[PDB]
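Hey team,

Sharing the granulin A run so nobody has to redo it. Sequence (31 residues) first:
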Amino acid sequence: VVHCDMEVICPDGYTCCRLPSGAWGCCPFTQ
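Structure output:
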Protein backbone atom coordinates (compact mmCIF):
# COMPACT_ATOMS: atom_id res chain seq x y z
CA VAL A 1 0.00 0.00 0.00
CA VAL A 2 1.21 3.57 -0.62
CA HIS A 3 0.74 5.25 2.78
CA CYS A 4 0.07 8.74 1.38
CA ASP A 5 0.22 9.89 5.02
CA MET A 6 -0.82 8.98 8.59
CA GLU A 7 -4.47 9.84 7.86
CA VAL A 8 -5.05 7.83 4.66
CA ILE A 9 -3.58 4.93 2.65
CA CYS A 10 -4.08 4.06 -1.04
CA PRO A 11 -2.69 1.12 -3.00
CA ASP A 12 -0.59 1.78 -6.14
CA GLY A 13 -3.74 1.17 -8.23
CA TYR A 14 -5.25 4.29 -6.59
CA THR A 15 -4.35 8.00 -6.62
CA CYS A 16 -4.35 10.12 -3.43
CA CYS A 17 -5.96 13.58 -3.46
CA ARG A 18 -6.19 16.38 -0.87
CA LEU A 19 -9.58 18.01 -0.21
CA PRO A 20 -10.02 21.79 -0.17
CA SER A 21 -10.25 21.61 3.64
CA GLY A 22 -6.92 19.93 4.48
CA ALA A 23 -8.53 16.50 4.02
CA TRP A 24 -7.59 13.45 1.92
CA GLY A 25 -9.48 11.30 -0.61
CA CYS A 26 -8.68 8.25 -2.77
CA CYS A 27 -9.64 7.81 -6.44
CA PRO A 28 -8.80 4.88 -8.72
CA PHE A 29 -7.70 5.44 -12.34
CA THR A 30 -9.62 2.64 -14.12
CA GLN A 31 -11.71 4.35 -16.83
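Strands lie at 2-5, 8-10, 14-18, 24-28.

Ping me if you want the raw files.
A.
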